[PDB]
Nucleic acid binder design. Structure first.
Lengths: 63, 143, 181, 58
RNA sequence: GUAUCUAGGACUACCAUGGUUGCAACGGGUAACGGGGAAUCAGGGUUCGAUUCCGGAGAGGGAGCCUGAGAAACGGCUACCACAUCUAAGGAAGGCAGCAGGCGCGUAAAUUACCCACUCCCAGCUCGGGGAGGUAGUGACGAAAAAUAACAAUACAGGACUCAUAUCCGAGGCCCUGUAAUUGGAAUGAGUACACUUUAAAUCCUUUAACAAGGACCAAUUGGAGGGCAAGUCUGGUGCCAGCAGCCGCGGUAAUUCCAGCUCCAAUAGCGUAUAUUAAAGUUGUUGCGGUUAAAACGUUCGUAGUUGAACUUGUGCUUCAUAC
């Protein structure tokens, strides 16, 4: 103990900080956590999107 | 005496050595490469095999004993091996016609001791590591 | 990769493994410096050779040569900062008179014992494991720290260490509880 | 010849098999190198034995 | 001349008879992707390079071709061959040498996990996409660092030591040294877990409150003890048997090698075994071998290739200064 280096990013205002704001890195003090996926099943719904044309409203029954 | 000692004879000096490393008895397993021809496994290190018999190879003179070897047919190529099982007992660990990992015998192609012309050595029979069987440090596969 | 774990293999095993006088010398080092395994001594002995094979090569350059100085004295910058060579014998010829023990006498396992912090030729050697040694801000777990000569005076103790007096047991303080409770 | 292998493992069958059971689990690396000093220096002050061997029993 | 993006026998037409090689053409072999580089010694070297970077090829086989700026593309199509699938029998469709997997083969190679946060790529694009890339689980290929005690009187003897007395001898012995399942003093982190931090998120390390050693415990092994070659003429067993053993050799009924037990040695979170390779090897030798007799000078001479070829053709003087003294 007695030495613990780190980074600090003092913006000007929060809404101007609300432009740059790496969100996944903001997410520790993120009040803004949305849209869980989780990236393994989103492919499987995307591949089934390719086999229906025009409407794409039949994959409610595929999970 | 001898060498082409000029300064423009590096053609003779390399064509001579090229033609006279064939008489380096041990650099004729770089050149003629009989490994895939005369070795019982095709140049590998170990070999899995399947025991065929229990050959009591008698000892060569002037030592009398009976070495208790084992005649393996492999599975790699269908060559034949007379391998060897060391450290008294452990023919009782053979359970015949069950598979064997034979190995090289440490004189790089020759028989070693009083064994006549037998060039191999069992290191694992039924996957249980024979050096861990004289202590019976692991359990023998019996059923 | 890529560059996977780039080698620098130390640990030079000797040529003939049981030369009797080579074996009767190693324990004339282990009593002197409380070292664990023998290839520790081959670790430091290998360090001398890369010095010497650099050192003896420069003496084949015809002074004045550019290589013999900016690589020459720059070796000697290190060999005095490590606290091994003096200032009078600074020159490239004298660097070849370095025995193995002179590098070992800047080990932390002797620099805490040649200082009065240790009072034993092995209590030094395990004190560095249990973290009660500070070098100017930093506690050091590894006894092969080898000390530069500039940082000689700052070998002292940790403040969170029970010497000198922070949470002094603390297992003994629980042993100061188990007796009364 | 291959006259018999029926005596394979014979002398192991003629072994009395006494045991170990003890002997004081020994110091490892650094402390093992500590313990190899008394067995040299003072015992054995290199006294005159008239051409003998040091790790002897008798 | 034609074709091509373009040169060009690239191809057609006529015409010329040329090209190539003992300085190794041509054919054959390859357990041949080429290089960066890797291994190993003092040098000189041998050996290796499927493998992260560069260049090249290939997507079961050969062939073909569309779109395009760019593909003779295969996570494009078209045949055929092989292999194979769903078929209601009419037809339809296959390509993991991408990732993670499964079968095989073999001595021989990880989890059908997470994420685009990094590096960068891509589109219409600041945002989308990206099992590239990154994280993680597996992981003694490997490389580094380093835990197995530390300290204390008695202790039990060696030793100096003061001294009696001396080929003896003891005591004041003691810095010491060990033995002490004697005694302790116990010093700490593997554990240990709040909470932190790290992170896309999570874990690992580092910090960390609490928790953590009298060994029986938090308990190192692996090989050996004839020589080579470090270390028992220790005890018991076995008696040319079982075995050991790289080599030389032990066992043939007192085994310094066998089976053990006690002991002991070498390295040590490492060690043995195999094949391979390198050094040892001045046993491939240009540096550097040898040829009377140990292996080795053609039966003789001639002789192209090749290798190797004597001498001679601007050299110190003379004067000065810079310049050592």
């Amino acid at each position: 103990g007695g030495r613990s280096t780190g980074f600090a990013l003092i913006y000007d205002t929060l809404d101007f900080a609300k432009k740059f704001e790496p969100k996944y890195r903001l997410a520790r003090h993120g009040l803004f956590e949305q849209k869980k996926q989780t990236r393994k099943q989103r492919k499987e719904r995307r591949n089934r999107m390719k086999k229906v044309r025009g409407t794409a409203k039949a994959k409610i029954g595929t999970g | 005496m001898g060498k082409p000692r000029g300064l423009r004879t590096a053609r003779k000096h390399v064509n001579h050595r090229r033609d006279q490393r064939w008489a380096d008895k041990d650099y004729k397993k770089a050149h003629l490469g009989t490994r895939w021809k005369a070795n019982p496994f095709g140049g590998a290190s170990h070999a899995k095999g399947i025991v065929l018999e229990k050959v009591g190879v008698e000892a060569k003179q002037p030592n009398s004993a009976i070495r208790k070897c084992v005649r393996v047919q492999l599975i790699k190529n269908g060559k034949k091996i007379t391998a060897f099982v060391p450290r008294d007992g452990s023919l009782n660990y053979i359970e015949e016609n069950d598979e064997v990992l034979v190995a090289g015998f440490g004189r790089k192609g020759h028989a070693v001791g009083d064994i006549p012309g037998v060039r191999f050595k069992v290191v694992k029979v039924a996957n249980v590591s024979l050096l861990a069987l004289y202590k019976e440090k692991k359990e023998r596969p019996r059923s | 990769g890529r560059i996977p774990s780039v080698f620098s293999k130390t640990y030079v095993t000797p040529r003939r493994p049981y030369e009797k006088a080579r074996l009767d010398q190693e324990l004339k080092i282990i009593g002197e410096y409380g070292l664990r395994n023998k290839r520790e001594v081959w670790r430091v002995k290998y360090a001398l050779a890369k010095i010497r094979k650099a050192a003896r090569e420069l003496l084949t350059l015809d002074e004045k040569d550019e290589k013999r100085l900016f690589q020459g004295n720059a070796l000697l910058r290190r060999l005095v900062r490590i606290g091994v060579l003096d200032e009078s014998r600074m020159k490239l010829d004298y660097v070849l008179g370095l025995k193995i023990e002179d590098f070992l006498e800047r080990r932390l396992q002797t620099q805490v014992f040649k200082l009065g912090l240790a009072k034993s030729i092995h209590h030094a050697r395990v004190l560095i494991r249990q973290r009660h040694i500070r070098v100017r801000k930093q506690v050091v777990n590894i006894p092969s720290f080898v000390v530069r000569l500039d940082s000689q005076k700052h070998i002292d103790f940790s403040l969170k260490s029970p010497f000198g007096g922070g949470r002094p047991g603390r297992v003994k303080r629980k042993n100061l509880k188990k007796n009364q409770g | 010849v291959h006259g018999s292998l029926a005596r394979a493992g014979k002398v192991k069958g003629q072994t009395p098999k006494v045991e170990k059971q003890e002997k004081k689990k020994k110091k490892t690396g650094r402390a093992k190198r500590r313990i190899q000093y008394n067995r040299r220096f003072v015992n054995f002050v290199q006294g005159f034995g008239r051409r003998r061997g040091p790790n002897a029993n008798s």
